[PDB]
Symmetry: C3
Protein backbone atom coordinates (compact mmCIF):
# COMPACT_ATOMS: atom_id res chain seq x y z
CA UNK A 1 0.00 0.00 0.00
CA UNK A 2 0.90 3.69 -0.39
CA UNK A 3 2.69 6.00 2.04
CA UNK A 4 0.53 8.09 4.38
CA UNK A 5 1.28 11.14 6.48
CA UNK A 6 -0.29 12.04 9.82
CA UNK A 7 -2.22 15.31 10.09
CA UNK A 8 -4.36 15.70 13.16
CA UNK A 9 -5.47 12.10 13.53
CA UNK A 10 -5.94 11.24 9.89
CA UNK A 11 -3.96 9.64 7.08
CA UNK A 12 -3.17 11.83 4.07
CA UNK A 13 -1.84 10.72 0.68
CA UNK A 14 -0.47 13.79 -1.12
CA UNK A 15 -0.52 11.94 -4.46
CA UNK A 16 -4.28 12.48 -4.72
CA UNK A 17 -4.54 16.20 -5.49
CA UNK A 18 -7.42 18.55 -6.26
CA UNK A 19 -7.82 21.52 -8.64
CA UNK A 20 -10.43 24.33 -8.79
CA UNK A 21 -11.72 26.02 -11.97
CA UNK A 22 -13.77 29.21 -11.97
CA UNK A 23 -13.90 30.11 -8.27
CA UNK A 24 -14.21 33.91 -8.10
CA UNK A 25 -12.12 35.85 -5.60
CA UNK A 26 -15.20 37.84 -4.49
CA UNK A 27 -18.64 36.24 -4.14
CA UNK A 28 -21.83 38.36 -3.85
CA UNK A 29 -24.22 37.37 -1.03
CA UNK A 30 -27.36 35.84 -2.50
CA UNK A 31 -25.95 35.18 -5.98
CA UNK A 32 -25.40 31.71 -7.43
CA UNK A 33 -22.02 30.79 -8.88
CA UNK A 34 -20.91 27.62 -10.65
CA UNK A 35 -17.37 26.26 -10.49
CA UNK A 36 -15.72 22.91 -10.99
CA UNK A 37 -13.33 20.98 -8.78
CA UNK A 38 -11.68 17.68 -9.51
CA UNK A 39 -9.30 15.22 -7.92
CA UNK A 40 -6.57 13.36 -9.82
CA UNK A 41 -4.42 10.35 -8.97
CA UNK A 42 -0.87 11.67 -9.32
CA UNK A 43 0.50 8.49 -7.74
CA UNK A 44 0.64 4.84 -8.71
CA UNK A 45 -1.67 3.21 -6.15
CA UNK A 46 -5.19 2.69 -7.52
CA UNK A 47 -7.86 3.40 -4.87
CA UNK A 48 -10.93 1.09 -4.95
CA UNK A 49 -13.46 3.80 -4.01
CA UNK A 50 -13.23 7.60 -3.91
CA UNK A 51 -15.35 10.70 -3.48
CA UNK A 52 -14.95 14.48 -3.06
CA UNK A 53 -15.54 16.50 0.10
CA UNK A 54 -15.93 20.30 0.08
CA UNK A 55 -15.20 22.51 3.09
CA UNK A 56 -16.55 26.06 3.47
CA UNK A 57 -14.66 28.13 6.02
CA UNK A 58 -15.18 31.61 7.46
CA UNK A 59 -12.20 32.94 9.39
CA UNK A 60 -13.84 36.02 10.95
CA UNK A 61 -17.12 34.67 12.38
CA UNK A 62 -18.37 31.40 13.82
CA UNK A 63 -22.13 31.57 13.17
CA UNK A 64 -22.13 30.11 9.63
CA UNK A 65 -24.01 26.83 9.35
CA UNK A 66 -24.95 24.44 6.55
CA UNK A 67 -28.42 26.05 6.27
CA UNK A 68 -26.82 29.43 5.39
CA UNK A 69 -26.06 28.35 1.81
CA UNK A 70 -27.47 26.25 -1.01
CA UNK A 71 -25.20 23.65 -2.55
CA UNK A 72 -25.70 21.51 -5.66
CA UNK A 73 -23.29 19.25 -7.47
CA UNK A 74 -22.85 16.84 -10.34
CA UNK A 75 -20.22 14.09 -10.37
CA UNK A 76 -18.67 14.24 -13.87
CA UNK A 77 -21.34 13.14 -16.39
CA UNK A 78 -23.96 12.01 -13.82
CA UNK A 79 -26.99 14.18 -12.92
CA UNK A 80 -27.30 17.28 -10.74
CA UNK A 81 -28.29 16.72 -7.14
CA UNK A 82 -28.70 18.83 -4.02
CA UNK A 83 -25.97 18.29 -1.45
CA UNK A 84 -27.36 16.38 1.53
CA UNK A 85 -27.13 18.25 4.90
CA UNK A 86 -27.07 14.86 6.65
CA UNK A 87 -23.82 14.12 4.76
CA UNK A 88 -21.89 16.92 6.39
CA UNK A 89 -19.54 17.02 9.32
CA UNK A 90 -20.75 18.98 12.33
CA UNK A 91 -19.43 22.57 12.44
CA UNK A 92 -15.77 22.69 13.45
CA UNK A 93 -14.34 25.66 15.36
CA UNK A 94 -10.57 26.08 14.94
CA UNK A 95 -8.75 27.65 17.87
CA UNK A 96 -7.41 30.25 15.43
CA UNK A 97 -11.02 31.48 14.97
CA UNK A 98 -13.95 30.98 12.68
CA UNK A 99 -15.97 27.91 11.73
CA UNK A 100 -15.95 25.50 8.82
CA UNK A 101 -18.62 23.27 7.29
CA UNK A 102 -17.45 20.09 5.52
CA UNK A 103 -19.89 18.62 2.98
CA UNK A 104 -19.75 15.25 1.25
CA UNK A 105 -20.21 15.36 -2.54
CA UNK A 106 -19.70 11.70 -3.61
CA UNK A 107 -21.45 9.13 -5.78
CA UNK A 108 -21.35 7.62 -9.28
CA UNK A 109 -19.74 9.63 -12.07
CA UNK A 110 -21.88 8.62 -15.04
CA UNK A 111 -20.06 5.35 -15.74
CA UNK A 112 -16.68 6.84 -16.61
CA UNK A 113 -14.77 5.29 -13.72
CA UNK A 114 -17.77 4.25 -11.62
CA UNK A 115 -18.94 0.64 -11.57
CA UNK A 116 -22.40 -0.98 -11.34
CA UNK A 117 -22.00 -1.47 -7.56
CA UNK A 118 -21.64 2.32 -7.11
CA UNK A 119 -17.91 2.41 -6.37
CA UNK A 120 -15.74 5.04 -8.02
CA UNK A 121 -12.29 3.44 -8.38
CA UNK A 122 -9.48 5.81 -9.31
CA UNK A 123 -6.64 4.41 -11.45
CA UNK A 124 -3.45 6.36 -11.80
CA UNK A 125 -3.58 9.54 -13.92
CA UNK A 126 -7.40 9.38 -13.86
CA UNK A 127 -9.69 12.04 -12.39
CA UNK A 128 -13.23 12.71 -11.09
CA UNK A 129 -15.01 16.09 -11.32
CA UNK A 130 -17.71 17.87 -9.35
CA UNK A 131 -19.46 20.72 -11.09
CA UNK A 132 -20.64 22.78 -8.14
CA UNK A 133 -23.40 25.36 -7.78
CA UNK A 134 -23.17 27.51 -4.67
CA UNK A 135 -25.01 30.46 -3.19
CA UNK A 136 -24.80 32.02 0.25
CA UNK A 137 -27.91 33.59 1.69
CA UNK A 138 -28.22 37.36 1.51
CA UNK A 139 -27.24 39.17 4.67
CA UNK A 140 -24.12 37.17 5.51
CA UNK A 141 -20.60 38.36 4.75
CA UNK A 142 -16.99 37.42 5.37
CA UNK A 143 -13.79 39.34 4.63
CA UNK A 144 -11.55 36.25 4.59
CA UNK A 145 -13.04 32.88 3.67
CA UNK A 146 -12.09 29.75 1.78
CA UNK A 147 -13.36 26.76 -0.09
CA UNK A 148 -11.30 23.63 0.45
CA UNK A 149 -11.28 20.48 -1.64
CA UNK A 150 -10.74 17.39 0.52
CA UNK A 151 -10.49 14.23 -1.61
CA UNK A 152 -11.53 11.10 0.27
CA UNK A 153 -10.51 7.52 -0.40
CA UNK A 154 -11.19 4.02 0.91
CA UNK A 155 -7.72 2.45 1.24
CA UNK A 156 -8.86 -1.17 1.01
CA UNK A 157 -12.10 -2.56 -0.45
CA UNK A 158 -14.69 -2.75 2.28
CA UNK A 159 -13.31 0.05 4.41
CA UNK A 160 -15.68 2.38 6.24
CA UNK A 161 -15.56 6.17 6.30
CA UNK A 162 -13.89 7.56 9.42
CA UNK A 163 -15.29 11.13 9.72
CA UNK A 164 -19.09 11.00 10.23
CA UNK A 165 -20.80 12.60 7.25
CA UNK A 166 -17.72 12.71 4.98
CA UNK A 167 -16.41 10.23 2.43
CA UNK A 168 -13.27 8.19 3.08
CA UNK A 169 -11.01 6.66 5.73
CA UNK A 170 -7.94 8.30 4.13
CA UNK A 171 -7.68 11.64 2.33
CA UNK A 172 -5.77 13.45 -0.38
CA UNK A 173 -3.93 16.75 -0.49
CA UNK A 174 -6.09 19.63 0.72
CA UNK A 175 -6.54 22.32 -1.97
CA UNK A 176 -7.61 25.86 -1.09
CA UNK A 177 -9.46 28.72 -2.76
CA UNK A 178 -9.46 31.96 -0.75
CA UNK A 179 -12.27 34.44 -1.36
CA UNK A 180 -14.33 37.24 0.18
CA UNK A 181 -18.11 37.15 0.52
CA UNK A 182 -19.26 40.75 0.15
CA UNK A 183 -18.98 43.79 -2.10
CA UNK A 184 -16.57 43.94 -5.01
CA UNK A 185 -13.75 46.48 -5.17
CA UNK A 186 -14.43 50.10 -5.97
CA UNK A 187 -12.36 51.77 -8.69
CA UNK A 188 -8.82 52.62 -7.62
CA UNK A 189 -8.52 55.33 -10.31
Amino acid sequence: GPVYREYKGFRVNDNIVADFIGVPAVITPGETIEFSVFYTNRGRYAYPDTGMNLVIWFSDRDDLRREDFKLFYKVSRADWQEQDPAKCWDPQFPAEGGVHIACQMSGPDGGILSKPDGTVPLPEVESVTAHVRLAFREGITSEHAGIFALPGMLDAPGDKSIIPGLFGNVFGRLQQASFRLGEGPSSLY
Copy 2:
Protein backbone atom coordinates in the same frame (compact mmCIF):
# COMPACT_ATOMS: atom_id res chain seq x y z
CA GLY B 1 18.91 12.36 -18.65
CA PRO B 2 15.49 12.60 -16.97
CA VAL B 3 13.31 9.73 -15.78
CA TYR B 4 10.13 8.94 -17.73
CA ARG B 5 6.87 7.22 -16.81
CA GLU B 6 4.80 5.09 -19.15
CA TYR B 7 1.24 6.16 -19.92
CA LYS B 8 -0.49 4.31 -22.68
CA GLY B 9 2.48 3.79 -24.97
CA PHE B 10 3.99 7.21 -24.36
CA ARG B 11 6.72 8.66 -22.19
CA VAL B 12 5.68 11.25 -19.59
CA ASN B 13 7.92 13.53 -17.54
CA ASP B 14 5.84 14.82 -14.62
CA ASN B 15 8.41 17.59 -14.01
CA ILE B 16 7.03 19.59 -16.96
CA VAL B 17 3.70 20.86 -15.62
CA ALA B 18 0.97 23.14 -16.94
CA ASP B 19 -1.32 25.76 -15.39
CA PHE B 20 -4.51 27.40 -16.71
CA ILE B 21 -5.66 30.96 -16.01
CA GLY B 22 -9.15 32.30 -16.61
CA VAL B 23 -10.94 29.24 -17.99
CA PRO B 24 -14.63 29.65 -17.07
CA ALA B 25 -16.61 26.79 -15.54
CA VAL B 26 -19.49 27.45 -17.94
CA ILE B 27 -18.98 28.47 -21.57
CA THR B 28 -21.83 29.81 -23.73
CA PRO B 29 -22.22 28.17 -27.17
CA GLY B 30 -21.30 30.67 -29.88
CA GLU B 31 -19.40 32.95 -27.46
CA THR B 32 -15.67 33.68 -27.65
CA ILE B 33 -13.58 33.30 -24.49
CA GLU B 34 -9.90 34.02 -23.86
CA PHE B 35 -7.78 32.17 -21.31
CA SER B 36 -4.11 31.48 -20.85
CA VAL B 37 -2.16 28.27 -20.29
CA PHE B 38 1.54 27.84 -19.68
CA TYR B 39 3.99 25.03 -19.07
CA THR B 40 6.87 25.24 -16.62
CA ASN B 41 10.02 23.21 -16.17
CA ARG B 42 9.90 22.16 -12.52
CA GLY B 43 12.72 19.66 -13.11
CA ARG B 44 16.41 19.93 -13.80
CA TYR B 45 16.71 18.61 -17.36
CA ALA B 46 16.71 21.45 -19.90
CA TYR B 47 14.61 20.46 -22.92
CA PRO B 48 15.94 21.47 -26.37
CA ASP B 49 12.56 22.00 -28.05
CA THR B 50 9.04 22.23 -26.62
CA GLY B 51 5.50 23.24 -27.49
CA MET B 52 1.97 23.20 -26.05
CA ASN B 53 -0.76 20.75 -27.16
CA LEU B 54 -4.41 21.39 -26.23
CA VAL B 55 -7.12 18.72 -25.96
CA ILE B 56 -10.86 19.46 -26.10
CA TRP B 57 -12.97 16.61 -24.66
CA PHE B 58 -16.72 15.92 -24.39
CA SER B 59 -17.66 13.03 -22.13
CA ASP B 60 -21.38 12.86 -23.00
CA ARG B 61 -21.35 12.95 -26.81
CA ASP B 62 -19.10 11.75 -29.61
CA ASP B 63 -19.91 14.03 -32.58
CA LEU B 64 -17.60 16.94 -31.68
CA ARG B 65 -15.01 17.58 -34.39
CA ARG B 66 -12.33 20.20 -35.02
CA GLU B 67 -14.77 22.00 -37.36
CA ASP B 68 -17.19 22.62 -34.47
CA PHE B 69 -15.05 25.30 -32.81
CA LYS B 70 -12.72 28.17 -33.70
CA LEU B 71 -9.32 28.36 -32.08
CA PHE B 72 -6.61 31.04 -32.06
CA TYR B 73 -3.49 31.32 -29.95
CA LYS B 74 -0.31 33.34 -29.43
CA VAL B 75 2.91 31.92 -27.98
CA SER B 76 4.00 34.29 -25.20
CA ARG B 77 5.08 37.54 -26.86
CA ALA B 78 4.66 36.46 -30.52
CA ASP B 79 1.64 37.45 -32.65
CA TRP B 80 -1.74 35.72 -32.72
CA GLN B 81 -2.27 32.90 -35.20
CA GLU B 82 -5.16 30.67 -36.14
CA GLN B 83 -4.69 27.10 -34.96
CA ASP B 84 -4.04 24.81 -37.93
CA PRO B 85 -6.57 21.94 -38.29
CA ALA B 86 -3.91 20.01 -40.19
CA LYS B 87 -1.87 20.11 -36.96
CA CYS B 88 -4.38 18.04 -34.96
CA TRP B 89 -4.68 14.45 -33.95
CA ASP B 90 -7.65 12.58 -35.37
CA PRO B 91 -10.67 12.40 -33.04
CA GLN B 92 -10.05 9.87 -30.26
CA PHE B 93 -12.86 7.85 -28.65
CA PRO B 94 -12.36 6.59 -25.08
CA ALA B 95 -13.81 3.16 -24.37
CA GLU B 96 -16.16 4.71 -21.78
CA GLY B 97 -17.68 7.02 -24.42
CA GLY B 98 -17.18 10.59 -25.61
CA VAL B 99 -14.57 12.16 -27.86
CA HIS B 100 -11.54 14.38 -27.69
CA ILE B 101 -9.75 16.58 -30.22
CA ALA B 102 -6.06 17.25 -29.65
CA CYS B 103 -4.73 20.41 -31.30
CA GLN B 104 -1.10 21.50 -31.60
CA MET B 105 -0.34 25.04 -30.50
CA SER B 106 3.44 25.33 -31.04
CA GLY B 107 5.80 27.95 -32.48
CA PRO B 108 8.38 30.59 -31.52
CA ASP B 109 7.67 32.58 -28.38
CA GLY B 110 8.76 36.07 -29.40
CA GLY B 111 12.45 35.77 -28.62
CA ILE B 112 12.14 35.08 -24.90
CA LEU B 113 13.29 31.45 -24.90
CA SER B 114 13.15 30.72 -28.62
CA LYS B 115 16.36 30.46 -30.63
CA PRO B 116 17.23 31.58 -34.19
CA ASP B 117 16.99 27.99 -35.47
CA GLY B 118 13.21 27.97 -34.50
CA THR B 119 13.43 25.77 -31.39
CA VAL B 120 11.96 26.73 -28.02
CA PRO B 121 14.28 25.32 -25.33
CA LEU B 122 12.97 25.14 -21.76
CA PRO B 123 15.62 25.55 -19.05
CA GLU B 124 14.70 24.80 -15.48
CA VAL B 125 12.20 27.20 -13.87
CA GLU B 126 11.45 28.85 -17.21
CA SER B 127 8.03 28.80 -18.84
CA VAL B 128 6.16 29.22 -22.13
CA THR B 129 2.58 30.45 -22.38
CA ALA B 130 -0.19 30.28 -24.95
CA HIS B 131 -2.86 32.96 -24.87
CA VAL B 132 -5.89 31.20 -26.32
CA ARG B 133 -9.12 32.35 -27.96
CA LEU B 134 -11.82 29.68 -28.22
CA ALA B 135 -15.41 29.59 -29.41
CA PHE B 136 -17.77 26.65 -29.97
CA ARG B 137 -20.37 26.94 -32.70
CA GLU B 138 -23.96 27.52 -31.65
CA GLY B 139 -26.18 24.49 -31.43
CA ILE B 140 -23.68 22.24 -29.65
CA THR B 141 -23.64 21.64 -25.89
CA SER B 142 -22.02 19.41 -23.32
CA GLU B 143 -22.81 18.84 -19.67
CA HIS B 144 -19.34 17.50 -18.75
CA ALA B 145 -16.36 18.53 -20.90
CA GLY B 146 -12.76 19.49 -20.37
CA ILE B 147 -9.74 21.26 -21.75
CA PHE B 148 -6.48 19.41 -21.21
CA ALA B 149 -3.01 20.94 -21.43
CA LEU B 150 -0.46 18.48 -22.84
CA PRO B 151 3.06 19.91 -22.94
CA GLY B 152 5.11 18.31 -25.69
CA MET B 153 8.85 18.06 -25.86
CA LEU B 154 11.67 16.70 -28.00
CA ASP B 155 13.92 14.60 -25.77
CA ALA B 156 16.95 15.08 -28.04
CA PRO B 157 17.68 17.69 -30.72
CA GLY B 158 16.52 16.30 -34.02
CA ASP B 159 13.84 14.01 -32.68
CA LYS B 160 10.57 13.64 -34.54
CA SER B 161 7.12 14.05 -33.04
CA ILE B 162 5.42 10.78 -32.22
CA ILE B 163 1.66 11.56 -32.35
CA PRO B 164 0.73 12.73 -35.88
CA GLY B 165 -0.50 16.31 -35.73
CA LEU B 166 0.84 16.95 -32.22
CA PHE B 167 4.16 18.28 -31.01
CA GLY B 168 6.66 16.14 -29.13
CA ASN B 169 8.06 12.63 -28.80
CA VAL B 170 7.78 12.85 -25.00
CA PHE B 171 5.20 14.74 -22.97
CA GLY B 172 4.68 16.61 -19.74
CA ARG B 173 2.07 16.22 -17.01
CA LEU B 174 -1.49 16.47 -18.31
CA GLN B 175 -3.45 19.37 -16.75
CA GLN B 176 -7.25 19.54 -16.71
CA ALA B 177 -9.96 22.19 -16.71
CA SER B 178 -13.53 20.82 -16.41
CA PHE B 179 -16.41 22.96 -17.64
CA ARG B 180 -19.89 22.80 -19.14
CA LEU B 181 -20.82 24.08 -22.60
CA GLY B 182 -24.37 25.33 -22.15
CA GLU B 183 -26.45 27.69 -20.04
CA GLY B 184 -25.14 29.28 -16.85
CA PRO B 185 -26.82 28.38 -13.55
CA SER B 186 -30.22 29.75 -12.68
CA SER B 187 -30.56 31.34 -9.25
CA LEU B 188 -30.67 28.90 -6.33
CA TYR B 189 -32.59 31.37 -4.12
Copy 3:
Protein backbone atom coordinates in the same frame (compact mmCIF):
# COMPACT_ATOMS: atom_id res chain seq x y z
CA GLY C 1 16.29 21.93 8.20
CA PRO C 2 15.25 22.07 4.54
CA VAL C 3 17.29 21.71 1.35
CA TYR C 4 17.60 24.68 -0.99
CA ARG C 5 18.08 24.97 -4.72
CA GLU C 6 20.02 27.75 -6.49
CA TYR C 7 18.23 30.04 -8.91
CA LYS C 8 20.05 33.10 -10.16
CA GLY C 9 21.93 33.87 -6.96
CA PHE C 10 19.10 33.03 -4.55
CA ARG C 11 17.97 30.05 -2.50
CA VAL C 12 14.65 28.39 -3.31
CA ASN C 13 12.65 25.84 -1.30
CA ASP C 14 10.17 24.28 -3.76
CA ASN C 15 8.09 22.95 -0.83
CA ILE C 16 6.63 26.43 -0.20
CA VAL C 17 4.23 26.87 -3.12
CA ALA C 18 1.67 29.51 -4.09
CA ASP C 19 -1.76 29.43 -5.76
CA PHE C 20 -3.83 32.12 -7.54
CA ILE C 21 -7.63 32.48 -7.48
CA GLY C 22 -9.60 34.78 -9.78
CA VAL C 23 -6.86 36.23 -11.99
CA PRO C 24 -8.48 37.04 -15.36
CA ALA C 25 -6.63 36.30 -18.58
CA VAL C 26 -7.50 39.76 -19.93
CA ILE C 27 -7.39 42.93 -17.81
CA THR C 28 -8.97 46.17 -19.11
CA PRO C 29 -6.66 49.18 -18.74
CA GLY C 30 -7.97 51.53 -16.05
CA GLU C 31 -10.19 48.84 -14.47
CA THR C 32 -9.74 47.52 -10.91
CA ILE C 33 -9.74 43.75 -10.34
CA GLU C 34 -9.55 41.74 -7.14
CA PHE C 35 -7.91 38.32 -6.93
CA SER C 36 -6.46 36.22 -4.14
CA VAL C 37 -3.10 34.54 -3.79
CA PHE C 38 -1.79 32.36 -1.01
CA TYR C 39 1.32 30.36 -0.13
CA THR C 40 1.18 26.92 1.47
CA ASN C 41 3.81 24.91 3.33
CA ARG C 42 3.89 21.59 1.46
CA GLY C 43 7.00 20.59 3.37
CA ARG C 44 7.75 19.68 6.96
CA TYR C 45 10.09 22.49 8.11
CA ALA C 46 8.17 25.21 9.94
CA TYR C 47 9.56 28.60 8.96
CA PRO C 48 9.71 31.15 11.80
CA ASP C 49 8.68 34.14 9.65
CA THR C 50 7.09 34.42 6.20
CA GLY C 51 5.58 36.95 3.80
CA MET C 52 4.39 37.30 0.22
CA ASN C 53 6.09 39.15 -2.66
CA LEU C 54 4.27 39.94 -5.91
CA VAL C 55 6.01 40.63 -9.24
CA ILE C 56 4.34 42.49 -12.13
CA TRP C 57 5.89 41.72 -15.50
CA PHE C 58 5.49 43.13 -19.00
CA SER C 59 7.42 41.20 -21.62
CA ASP C 60 6.77 43.55 -24.58
CA ARG C 61 7.68 46.96 -23.16
CA ASP C 62 10.14 48.35 -20.65
CA ASP C 63 8.67 51.70 -19.55
CA LEU C 64 6.36 50.30 -16.84
CA ARG C 65 7.14 51.47 -13.31
CA ARG C 66 5.55 51.07 -9.89
CA GLU C 67 3.75 54.41 -10.30
CA ASP C 68 1.94 53.11 -13.40
CA PHE C 69 -0.45 50.97 -11.35
CA LYS C 70 -2.30 50.97 -8.04
CA LEU C 71 -1.89 48.03 -5.68
CA PHE C 72 -3.66 47.27 -2.38
CA TYR C 73 -3.63 44.11 -0.31
CA LYS C 74 -4.93 42.46 2.82
CA VAL C 75 -3.17 39.57 4.59
CA SER C 76 -5.83 36.95 5.43
CA ARG C 77 -8.16 38.48 8.03
CA ALA C 78 -6.10 41.60 8.73
CA ASP C 79 -7.16 44.96 7.24
CA TRP C 80 -6.71 46.37 3.74
CA GLN C 81 -3.62 48.51 3.10
CA GLU C 82 -1.94 50.25 0.18
CA GLN C 83 1.22 48.54 -1.00
CA ASP C 84 4.27 50.65 -0.15
CA PRO C 85 6.35 51.80 -3.16
CA ALA C 86 9.46 51.93 -0.95
CA LYS C 87 9.00 48.18 -0.30
CA CYS C 88 9.65 47.27 -3.91
CA TRP C 89 12.67 46.08 -5.82
CA ASP C 90 14.01 48.47 -8.42
CA PRO C 91 12.74 47.76 -11.94
CA GLN C 92 14.51 44.70 -13.38
CA PHE C 93 15.25 44.44 -17.12
CA PRO C 94 15.63 41.01 -18.76
CA ALA C 95 18.20 40.92 -21.54
CA GLU C 96 15.47 39.85 -24.00
CA GLY C 97 13.42 42.98 -23.22
CA GLY C 98 10.57 43.92 -20.93
CA VAL C 99 10.50 44.95 -17.29
CA HIS C 100 9.25 43.59 -14.02
CA ILE C 101 8.42 45.27 -10.72
CA ALA C 102 8.58 43.16 -7.55
CA CYS C 103 6.45 44.36 -4.61
CA GLN C 104 6.53 43.27 -0.98
CA MET C 105 3.12 42.42 0.50
CA SER C 106 3.99 41.05 3.93
CA GLY C 107 2.72 41.57 7.46
CA PRO C 108 0.53 40.03 10.16
CA ASP C 109 -2.46 37.92 9.11
CA GLY C 110 -5.03 38.81 11.76
CA GLY C 111 -3.70 36.48 14.43
CA ILE C 112 -4.44 33.29 12.52
CA LEU C 113 -0.82 32.27 12.24
CA SER C 114 0.77 35.58 13.25
CA LYS C 115 2.10 36.01 16.76
CA PRO C 116 2.25 39.05 19.07
CA ASP C 117 5.87 39.72 18.12
CA GLY C 118 4.65 40.31 14.54
CA THR C 119 6.16 37.18 13.00
CA VAL C 120 4.13 34.94 10.71
CA PRO C 121 5.37 31.37 11.25
CA LEU C 122 4.28 28.78 8.72
CA PRO C 123 3.74 25.26 10.10
CA GLU C 124 3.28 22.33 7.79
CA VAL C 125 0.06 22.20 5.69
CA GLU C 126 -0.73 25.76 6.78
CA SER C 127 -1.14 28.74 4.46
CA VAL C 128 -1.28 32.56 4.35
CA THR C 129 -3.47 34.51 1.92
CA ALA C 130 -3.23 37.92 0.29
CA HIS C 131 -6.40 39.44 -1.12
CA VAL C 132 -5.19 41.85 -3.80
CA ARG C 133 -6.73 44.85 -5.56
CA LEU C 134 -4.88 45.90 -8.76
CA ALA C 135 -5.47 48.47 -11.51
CA PHE C 136 -3.23 49.73 -14.31
CA ARG C 137 -3.60 53.31 -15.46
CA GLU C 138 -5.42 53.66 -18.75
CA GLY C 139 -3.19 54.27 -21.73
CA ILE C 140 -0.92 51.32 -20.94
CA THR C 141 -1.23 47.94 -22.63
CA SER C 142 0.67 44.70 -22.91
CA GLU C 143 0.10 41.68 -25.16
CA HIS C 144 2.03 39.28 -22.92
CA ALA C 145 2.27 40.07 -19.21
CA GLY C 146 2.24 38.18 -15.94
CA ILE C 147 1.76 38.27 -12.21
CA PHE C 148 4.25 36.16 -10.25
CA ALA C 149 3.82 35.02 -6.66
CA LEU C 150 7.16 34.87 -4.83
CA PRO C 151 6.89 33.63 -1.23
CA GLY C 152 9.67 34.88 1.01
CA MET C 153 10.84 33.20 4.19
CA LEU C 154 13.36 33.79 6.89
CA ASP C 155 15.18 30.50 7.33
CA ALA C 156 15.88 30.56 11.09
CA PRO C 157 14.68 33.54 13.16
CA GLY C 158 17.71 35.86 13.14
CA ASP C 159 18.07 36.15 9.39
CA LYS C 160 17.64 39.37 7.39
CA SER C 161 16.03 39.84 3.98
CA ILE C 162 18.42 39.44 1.07
CA ILE C 163 16.68 41.44 -1.72
CA PRO C 164 16.22 45.08 -0.61
CA GLY C 165 12.54 45.98 -0.55
CA LEU C 166 11.31 42.38 -0.46
CA PHE C 167 10.65 39.97 2.38
CA GLY C 168 12.93 36.99 2.94
CA ASN C 169 16.45 35.59 2.61
CA VAL C 170 15.13 32.39 1.02
CA PHE C 171 12.15 31.99 -1.25
CA GLY C 172 9.41 29.57 -2.21
CA ARG C 173 8.32 28.21 -5.57
CA LEU C 174 7.51 30.97 -8.04
CA GLN C 175 3.93 30.76 -9.32
CA GLN C 176 2.75 32.45 -12.54
CA ALA C 177 -0.45 33.95 -13.93
CA SER C 178 -0.20 35.07 -17.60
CA PHE C 179 -2.58 37.69 -18.93
CA ARG C 180 -3.01 40.45 -21.48
CA LEU C 181 -3.62 44.09 -20.54
CA GLY C 182 -5.89 45.48 -23.25
CA GLU C 183 -9.13 44.77 -25.08
CA GLY C 184 -11.03 41.51 -24.72
CA PRO C 185 -11.48 39.25 -27.72
CA SER C 186 -13.88 40.12 -30.49
CA SER C 187 -16.23 37.37 -31.62
CA LEU C 188 -14.68 34.57 -33.71
CA TYR C 189 -18.09 33.68 -35.24
